[PDB]
């Protein structure tokens, strides 16, 4: 078939794990004696057919269904008023359903009772076994919403008493009635009334999730520029973290309930700062700690100028920077977006602490000096490995001067060089250059330099070694050739 | 289904069109564009979309009617006072509220012990008992009548509650 809805169950394999402890305890002989029967042929199943025919009635609106409505209306009109039934004809079915659920008892099938505890237990076991992961998740959701309140409020004595009622055995019920402790401690309905408040809170949380998730998901997926998580949380009253987690959970369940692998970039995109903070790997038995400050430095409340500098930096800084803001405008291609946000995202965010529009530096190449040996030695310098050389000496290797020493604009850079295994001479990439200094593990997710204030407070004001340096850079081909240089005077054309 | 070199390549099987993911992708595709959604931006430098009126207009333009037309209908987990108290002490009560693939479960261990269902339910019972003591002392409002509580009701007071509106014990007392 192709539907395999709850009426005709998908056939299942044998040797499958049983949902309940007594069925983990099944003897294999009795397991085998079990017969493969439809769901409705179960005594409890057949009684539930008797119960659910009314659920069919409310929709399948046949002439027979109208006749059954008439009969059930007549039966329900046993109420003295009758007017309530008249107005509730559209929902008299739920009254009969509630009363039918109440009037269910366990005994012998051949006797006047519909089904026994064993049949009910078997139906539960196999109904659970017949559930996919989605079905099991929905069952656990139902448990959370319905049973946890009542179960939390109820005492263990009350639960054992309800177990005795389910077993419906007169002898054990009589023993419990004999027991004094069981009689006295059951009657606390005023206390039990807290159960509806507990249920209401759990249900309002589940309602937040399942109903307010799709709406804000649609808004954020449509225009994350218009409705980013902070605005979304502020205008819906929820938490920043709760809204972000709702979005992540909804996308991941949409991926998981289908058979599409989720995009792991979403938690990284919505939790960039938290991803850098809290997502370390750990080993066994080491009880790692938490670092509160990145570095040890003087606080900014200690000076008027530090306070002003921090205030200016905060005003120039974001508060929550997202995958759409200016700092990420350098991800101009979808492949750049995917490679930056999918994997090596930690590498990319760690390549530089500050936030810029590059995440790196362009590479370039150098010319190889003429080898007067010629092709006798052109084979050299080609190897199996990249050879990296970093300069040292005075004027190089100082941590305090790191940002100035590996700045492309500095006449005195550190001059790193890489020889490729094919003999090519190239410059170093920003990460290779940065790997020759002391480690620097921190990031700044909110300061974006281009939005600094200007023109109110920030209004910046103002030997022949420079000539000698320009001479050094200047080409010197004129030495071989006020006798000013002129274009050639053509002779062949005359 | 053909690469540059011309040979055949593996194509993932199409996802079921009835899936929520398929609906989401389809809805993103044929719905209206972002730049056609609003013609003018907010009055004060800010993009339109904060107020529930603009939000609802945008949602309708996108082809979906909000179940939360006004700020009063959306729930607010700040008001709940018992769920946070129970959550803070021993753990989450709505275990499986944030579950995926059957993982990330926060339920007690199945091995009956100092970390199992009996102890966890006993401690939750203690916390709700503390809140009920608050109710009795009058700091908290009296809870409404519940089905579990209604299920006992002397076996005769259920009839009175049913014949009356009887949402609260105060209402039943007035009745």
């Amino acid at each position: 078939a192709p539907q395999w809805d709850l009426w005709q169950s998908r056939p299942r394999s044998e040797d499958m794990d049983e949902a309940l402890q007594p069925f983990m305890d099944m003897p294999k002989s009795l397991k085998d004696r079990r017969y493969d029967i439809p769901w409705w042929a179960n005594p409890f199943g057949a009684w539930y057919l008797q119960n659910i025919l009314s659920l069919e009635l409310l929709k399948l609106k046949s002439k027979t269904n109208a006749e059954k409505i008439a009969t059930y209306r007549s039966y329900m009109r046993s109420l003295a008023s009758g007017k309530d039934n008249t107005m509730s004809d559209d929902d008299v079915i739920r009254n009969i359903i509630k009363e039918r659920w109440k009037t269910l008892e366990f005994g012998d099938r051949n006797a006047g009772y519909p089904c026994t505890f064993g049949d009910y237990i078997q139906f539960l076991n196999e109904w659970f076994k017949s559930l996919d992961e989605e079905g099991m998740q929905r069952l656990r959701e139902h448990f959370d919403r319905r049973i946890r309140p009542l179960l939390a409020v109820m005492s263990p004595v009350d639960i054992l008493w309800l177990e005795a009622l389910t077993q419906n055995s007169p002898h054990n019920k009589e023993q419990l009635q004999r027991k004094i402790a069981f009689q006295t401690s059951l009657g606390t309905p005023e206390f039990f009334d807290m159960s509806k408040r507990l249920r209401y809170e759990i249900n309002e949380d589940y309602k937040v999730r399942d109903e307010l998730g799709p709406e804000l998901f649609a808004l954020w997926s449509k225009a994350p520029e218009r409705w980013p998580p902070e605005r979304l949380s502020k205008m819906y009253g929820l938490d920043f973290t709760l809204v972000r987690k709702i979005l992540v959970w909804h996308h991941f369940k949409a991926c998981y309930d289908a058979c599409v692998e989720p995009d792991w970039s979403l938690p990284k995109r919505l939790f960039a700062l938290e991803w850098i903070r809290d997502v370390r790997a750990r080993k066994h038995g080491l009880f790692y700690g938490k670092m509160r400050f990145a570095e040890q430095k003087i606080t900014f409340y200690s000076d008027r100028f530090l306070f002003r500098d921090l205030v200016n930096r905060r005003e120039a800084s974001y508060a929550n920077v997202w995958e759409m803001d200016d700092p990420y405008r350098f991800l101009q291609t979808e492949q750049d977006y995917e490679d930056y946000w999918g994997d090596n995202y930690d590498v990319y965010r760690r390549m530089f602490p500050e936030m810029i529009g590059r995440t790196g530096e362009p590479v370039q190449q150098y010319g190889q000096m003429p080898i007067w040996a010629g092709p006798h030695r052109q084979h050299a310098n080609k190897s199996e490995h990249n050879w990296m050389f970093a300069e040292i000496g005075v004027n190089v290797g100082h941590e305090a001067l790191k940002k100035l020493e590996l700045d492309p604009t500095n006449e005195k850079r550190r001059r790193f060089v890489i020889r490729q295994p094919d003999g090519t001479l190239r410059s170093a990439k920003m990460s290779e250059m940065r790997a020759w200094y002391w480690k620097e593990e921190w990031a700044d997710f909110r300061f974006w330099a281009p939005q600094m204030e200007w023109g109110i407070e920030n209004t910046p004001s103002q030997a022949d070694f420079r000539k000698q340096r320009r001479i050094q850079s200047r080409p010197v081909k004129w030495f071989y050739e006020e006798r000013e240089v002129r274009w050639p005077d053509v002779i062949n054309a005359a | 289904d053909v690469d540059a070199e011309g040979n055949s390549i593996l194509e993932p099987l199409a996802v079921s069109p009835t899936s929520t993911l398929a609906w989401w992708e389809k809805w993103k595709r044929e719905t209206v564009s972002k730049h056609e959604l609003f013609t003018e931006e907010g009055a004060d430098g800010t993009p339109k979309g904060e107020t529930f009126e603009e939000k609802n207009e945008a949602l309708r333009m996108m082809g979906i009617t909000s179940s939360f037309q006004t700020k009063d209908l959306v729930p607010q987990p700040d008001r709940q006072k018992l769920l946070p108290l129970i959550r803070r002490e021993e753990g989450e009560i709505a275990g499986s509220l944030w579950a995926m693939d059957g993982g990330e479960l926060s339920y007690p261990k199945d091995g009956g012990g100092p970390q199992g269902w009996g102890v966890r339910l006993w401690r939750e019972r203690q916390l709700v008992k503390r809140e009920y003591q608050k109710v009795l002392d009058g700091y908290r409002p009296v809870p409404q009548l519940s089905t579990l509580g209604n299920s006992v009701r002397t076996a005769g007071d259920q009839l009175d509650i049913e014949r009356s509106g009887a949402q609260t014990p105060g209402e039943l007392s007035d009745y």
Binding site: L124, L151, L165 | T147
Partner: peptide
């Protein structure tokens, strides 16, 4: 070894319909 939470299911063997009045059905 991760537990499969079979006590969830064991808690369903009780007759919650007696108290909840159709607790297994949709919420009203």
């Amino acid at each position: 070894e991760a537990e499969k939470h079979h006590d969830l299911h064991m808690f369903y063997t009780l007759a919650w319909w007696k108290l909840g009045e159709g607790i297994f059905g949709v919420d009203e």
